[PDB]
Write a protein that binds this ligand. Structure first.
Ligand SMILES: O=C[C@H](O)CO
Ligand SMILES: O=C[C@H](O)CO
Lengths: 231, 187, 72, 72
């Protein structure tokens, strides 16, 4: 039995800015392989870095001020007000620093997922805004790769029982071993699982959609291919 | 939540401050050691802080997107790293409780009555008040192993057709039954 | 020196920023892609920063009270 | 023509405005008081207005349908 389907990325993530600024450098090769947590961009941190330190200086000051008054009020050398106001400022500073720190951190646009980044929709030197609609880039885990197969709800059961009645080659709980046949006609050398748990159902058709998972090193398989699973 | 968490704490700091200010100034005006203005203003700020904090708290909370129902989630319409907006048109994902599963049956208003009386006249196998036991037959032809209730209380009526729609309830562990199947209930 | 040290770095951070700003705007003005009033201001900030830094540096330095003479 | 007449004057009002705006920004770029890009946007609007007015004028004129040929 041959089940028609489309290959899809195993995982998709969008790269976006979370701080305002100018793209200083784009540290990645379009179309290369990037790891999750890897810096993909550098937003000119000249200022954020400046504010952050400007802040810490402030906190260092107000903090001393406060700690000194805490001591003094205990001996009434100072009033309950002055200490209150002093500890007030101290708290505000401490807050500012934390916000400064957060923004500086967002200056290094990291990759959320491990996969394959394509073209960078943003040129170096460009202006980037937190909340902006468009994404700077898109990474894609392409190794284990999906193959979305759609069968009429009936067939999914039929297969499901053959799986339990040993009539199908086990591949794991709810998974049968399968082979892939490119629209090329050729036979993808490796083979993978065909999980039976449903992922979606077009109630307007009643048909179900399940996923096959093939190993894809060498990156021979790419999203969008019209293939055929085999049981 | 890096920031929401930051604003929330930034806020709580403030409240802690203004609250002290108030509770104190509430005592000085008490002995005319501070004008009515000074205290009114102090309690003003205090109330504002208290409000700010509550709003910060609410936003932080929404940071963790929970599932409203228990059931089966399908694909996630949103990728990680994506930008999400309150009020946005599209839903991030849809959960569907498929275990007890419904089977919408449509019979002409007449038939519904015919069956309703057989139910009362014991001519139909009771399954509960207003419910008769029923079996399911997939469009496959096969016979769904389990069986369930066929509630007679109407759910909707296409007045343009006069026909009524009632629901059958089948157990569906194993998740063999899925939405959209064209089946047949049997009595 | 906890603070002086902090102000001093707080400062240098600032200068590093305004300095970049200035050096860049001067390029723009040369293409008339920014009013010289914008540049003037940019270089104005740069000079203030540069001044701040120097004063910061001076104060930090005075943080280690040294002995003027050799003796007892 | 109640409206076409209104739109035509509504427009001319606009043009009179943006035109002044432009002519003034034109003296600024001359003294590097503004960027080329600014005088650009200003002159951009000015040209759009001038176009709008001409279209308004044309339409108002057609409010008076005329005969293409001499005949019966
Ligand atoms: O931008 C999406 C792909 O990475 C490239 O073209
Ligand atoms: O929500 C059901 C499917 O997973 C998607 O669209």
């Amino acid at each position: 039995t041959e089940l028609p389907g489309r290959t899809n990325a195993f995982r998709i993530a969008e790269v976006r800015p979370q701080v305002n600024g100018i793209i200083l450098k784009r540290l990645f090769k379009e179309g290369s392989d990037v790891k999750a947590g890897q810096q993909l961009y550098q937003i000119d941190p000249a200022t954020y870095e400046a504010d952050y330190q400007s802040a810490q200086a402030n906190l260092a000051s107000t903090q001393e001020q406060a700690q000194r008054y805490k001591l003094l009020v205990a001996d009434q050398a100072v009033s309950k007000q002055q200490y209150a106001d002093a500890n007030a400022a101290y708290l505000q500073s401490k807050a500012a620093v934390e916000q400064a720190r957060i923004n500086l951190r967002y200056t290094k646009v990291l990759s959320p997922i491990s996969g394959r980044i394509g073209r960078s929709a943003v040129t170096e030197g460009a202006l980037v805004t937190n909340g902006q609609a468009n994404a700077m880039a898109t990474v894609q885990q392409l190794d284990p790769i999906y193959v979305d197969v759609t069968q009429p709800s009936t067939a999914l059961l039929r297969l499901r029982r053959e799986l339990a009645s040993g009539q199908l080659e086990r591949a794991g709980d709810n998974a049968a071993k399968v082979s892939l046949k490119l629209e090329d006609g050729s036979q993808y050398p490796l083979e993978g699982r065909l999980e039976f748990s449903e992922v979606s159902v077009d109630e307007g058709t009643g048909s179900v959609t399940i996923r096959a998972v093939f190993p894809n090193p060498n990156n021979e398989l790419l999203p969008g291919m019209f293939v055929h699973a085999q049981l």
